[PDB]
Amino acid sequence: KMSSFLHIGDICSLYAEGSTNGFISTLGLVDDRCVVQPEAGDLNNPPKKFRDCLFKLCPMNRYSAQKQFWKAAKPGANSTTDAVLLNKLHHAADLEKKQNETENRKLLGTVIQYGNVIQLLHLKSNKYLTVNKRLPALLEKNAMRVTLDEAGNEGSWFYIQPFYKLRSIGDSVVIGDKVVLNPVNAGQPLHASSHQLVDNPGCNEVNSVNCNTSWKIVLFMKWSDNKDDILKGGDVVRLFHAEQEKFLTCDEHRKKQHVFLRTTGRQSATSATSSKALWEVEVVQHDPCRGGAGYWNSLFRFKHLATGHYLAAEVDPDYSLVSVPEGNDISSIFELDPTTLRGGDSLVPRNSYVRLRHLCTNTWVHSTNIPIDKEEEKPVMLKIGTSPLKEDKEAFAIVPVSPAEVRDLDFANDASKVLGSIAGKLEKGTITQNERRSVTKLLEDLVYFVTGGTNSGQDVLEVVFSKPNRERQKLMREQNILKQIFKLLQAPFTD
Amino acid sequence: AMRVTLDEAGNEGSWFYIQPFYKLRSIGDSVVIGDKVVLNPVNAGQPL
Amino acid sequence: KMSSFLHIGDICSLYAEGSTNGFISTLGLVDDRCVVQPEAGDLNNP
Amino acid sequence: FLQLLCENHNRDLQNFLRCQNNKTNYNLVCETLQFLDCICGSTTGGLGLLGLYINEKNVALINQTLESLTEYCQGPCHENQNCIATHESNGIDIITALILNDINPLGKKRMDLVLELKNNASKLLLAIMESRHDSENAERILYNMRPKELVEVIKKAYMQGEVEFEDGENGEDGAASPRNVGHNIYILAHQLARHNKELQTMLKPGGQVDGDEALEFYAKHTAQIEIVRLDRTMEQIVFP
Amino acid sequence: QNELRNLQEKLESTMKLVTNLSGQLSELKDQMTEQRKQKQRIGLLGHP
Amino acid sequence: FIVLVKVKDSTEYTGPESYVAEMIRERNLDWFPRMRAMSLVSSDSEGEQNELRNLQEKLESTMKLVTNLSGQLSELKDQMTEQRKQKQRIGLLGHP
Amino acid sequence: IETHGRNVQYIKFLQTIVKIKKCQDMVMAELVNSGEDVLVFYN
Ligand SMILES: Nc1ncnc2c1ncn2[C@@H]1O[C@H](CO)[C@H](O[C@H]2O[C@@H](CO)[C@H](OP(=O)(O)O)[C@H](OP(=O)(O)O)[C@@H]2O)[C@H]1OP(=O)(O)O
């Protein structure tokens, strides 16, 4: 508490201020420029989703070897560097990229101050920031295109500068500075150009041109929660029981988000761990993410990823377990009990057993297995209520969830939904030109991203050891990969 | 069922397995005061 | 208060839980096996 | 010119410029010189072959800048080597690259220039290393040349052979014999060997074999002079 | 009759131990009390 | 020593044996108690393997660090609370 | 011509200042600054 903001790698977010007051919003995963949405909620009240402004204070790595690596396409046009020379040369470029890291790790610790030149990178999409100096925007050619790179390039070169720059140069950056950046090489500062966009009533183009566009340093979480074990922030979990070996599954069966848990197959083996364990748990304070980090008296809401639905409970009367669309009630704000052992060291727990107390009804939460529906055996409707007894059978814990898979799946699912929309356009009639140039050939690139298990070795019929993901393949079947099948049916059928 | 005896000196059926009810509490950690301790005789086999 | 239960030789007791919820009860001194008494009081009230 | 000016007597003149006051007047140039040299060779890791060709006559100024590197090189061990040590961990690479490799274009006066550059770079490095003792500092420059004894041996054999093959009858106009350059390298390696043991193992191996140019060249010189100057010093010097 | 490198080290240890036997305990107790009080405010915040 | 050692396989009774059982082959002139062994200077096992000016300094630092990890934090917290309370009195003073 | 550092003014004039197989190679480079987006046109 001597002063804040001393470490590159912070867990923060951003907000537009001024003409159109939006947020840093990647429209999907496959697009290339962010948007400015008045669709988004207040500056004091972020929307139901706010996971898109996930930037991090990146060091200024180099790109010259990576540039001379990519000089390599010009060498594809022409050879002779050629062969081993070419390889070693780009291999050296790769070593230099390794060296960029073997700088950033050392770099952590630096007090982030005024006038510096820093880089950025997303987390949710985990894509880069580069503004072109010769490739324009969509609305005006004078505005420069702000790109989302897989690797990152020299348009990641910024000027961390507030609105007026009344805060004089050299000092640390106050959390709340209206940070007007400036590209080093590209020139033109960033603009929140208020212009309507495709499929966007609703959203405004993020671009680079001489203007007076202000921002804000918007903290989400301190740098010390970069410990990946430390279950902080919006990190995501799985609500998977252990004595039953079943995860807490939600489904809109009767057009009602019944939250239950599926009958567990196998088991002598571990979890099949389906996608109905999408849970993120966050603490509650009206300014978001208050200080103290003790996690003892901390109180929590439960959030599902794919649905726009949080989690509450009320009474049954013939106590309930369904999911709720909103985030302002008290009856959704549940509670925990860390591992049930003698611990005053629980300042941040990790990936272990949990429980629940209630606040209003103020009882424990049982998990006594009572089958309900006669719709189908190995049922899909159960009961989870709030009763002041507690047994060993409440063995609920936390999965440290693998990040990459989640991201992959989400982009695929969103693409599929648009894919469905694309299919609808074709169905109504024909489609336009550049849709073929954009997303139509991007079909198997999403398939060959995690490879889908579409090519492997050959042995006896049970797939066992190692070649591509079964999870990915089933997931592929999973985000209406069925829906994609219908879309594909429609394309040939239309022809 | 096996006879559980009260010895003056003590013998090899004093050999137990300090294990909770489900053994959901995973092996290696300290024993929580309140664990539903389902023991097991080492040599004799049959739990209590 | 960092964590409890660190020393063999503890001064404790036992209680049966489940079907018949009794205690570890030596019937007298000269017998050979303990008993499970519902004669005994509550788990919360010995 | 700047290098020439800086070189004027070290200690006070050398030191004074080298550190200054006012953040070295918005200048602590030795690091800048290293960066400039890197840009010129722009090895940025392995020097792009030819960069030297691109330098054309221009590398000779950087050679004179490398000479100005030795211009900010001679004697003043503490200031010089404070910068030297910093550079060794810090940039060392131009010198390392030069030691590691030759030039793609067979340069006209370039062979001599390249040799001069190696000798110079070698001299600067050697001076700094000797003064320091600075073991892991030399271990870091030795971490620059991890190729070690094998690389050195190959270079020495090649240079000596070339020199013998075309011995030049141009007396005392520059001892740029291939063997002369190699000899300078050998001296530096021995000086380096006082830092590092593994390198010393490689050197012992170089000393015993089916005799070779390497033993002959040491014989042409294995001095290890060890003089001590002014006062309060415990110094060890070599020179061929 | 005063001893080696060690005697001075021993003196440091003795001083450190006696001094150390009190303050952190006190600090922890007060910390817990303050924490208990904020929780109370938190309870009021989430009170209805 | 040489007579008893000479005679067998050399592996047997090794440690000093098969140590020196190769060492005669390369004849390297350096087996013998030249000066450094000598016995003596045990110094009560070097004060139970305890080190120099430095060991005592290290002990001081360790003690200082562990002790220091708590009190000032506590002091600051209490100071802030007391200060918060006076401000309250100040607010009352400037209250209407 | 192609980017919005100017407007969509004549490609033919640009080609005239550089429209043999060499001309085709030059055209490919020119198209690259000016590639796609109906540079030739929508036909
Ligand atoms: N811990 C568990 N205990 C018991 N069954 C389990 C289990 N976790 C998952 N299972 C479920 O029980 C079924 C298997 O007994 C099923 O396995 C399915 O899991 C699929 C994973 O996507 C595989 O299909 P592939 O993608 O073709 O590999 C697999 O078949 P496989 O042997 O070929 O891998 C199979 O279909 C799986 O949950 P489901 O009921 O199947 O949804």
Author numbering:
A (entry chain B): 4 to 321, 353 to 529
B (entry chain A): 146 to 193
C (entry chain A): 4 to 49
D (entry chain C): 1972 to 2211
E (entry chain A): 2692 to 2739
F (entry chain B): 2644 to 2739
G (entry chain C): 1299 to 1317, 1323 to 1346
Which of the paper's sentences describe this entry?
Inositol 1,4,5-trisphosphate receptors (InsP3Rs) constitute a functionally important class of intracellular Ca2+ channels that are capable of converting a wide variety of cellular signals (e.g., hormones, neurotransmitters, growth factors, light, odorants, signaling proteins) to intracellular calcium signals, which trigger markedly different cellular actions ranging from gene transcription to secretion, from proliferation to cell death. In this study, we have also extended our structural analysis of InsP3R1 in an Apo-state to 3.9 Å resolution. Together, these structures reveal how InsP3R1 channel performs its mechanical work through ligand-driven allostery that removes the molecular barrier within the ion permeation pathway and allows for Ca2+ translocation across the membrane.
To further investigate how the structure of the InsP3R channel allows for ligand-initiated gating, we have now determined the 3D structure of InsP3R1 bound to adenophostin A (AdA), a highly potent agonist of InsP3Rs,8,9 to 4.1 Å resolution using single-particle cryo-EM analysis. To understand how ligand-binding triggers a drastic change in the permeability of InsP3R channel to specific ions, we determined the structure of InsP3R1 in the presence of activating concentrations of AdA (100 nM) and Ca2+ (300 nM), which works as a co-agonist to promote channel opening, as demonstrated in numerous electrophysiological studies. AdA is uniquely oriented such that its 3′′- and 4′′-phosphates interact with the ARM1 domain and the adenosine moiety bridges the binding pocket interacting with the β-TF2 domain. These complementary interactions provide the impetus for pulling the two domains towards each other, reducing the interstitial space of the binding pocket by 5 Å in the AdA-InsP3R1 structure. Ligand binding in the tetrameric channel results in a 5 Å closure of the cleft between the ARM1 and β-TF2 domains, while β-TF1 acts as a pivot for the concerted movement of ARM1 and β-TF2.
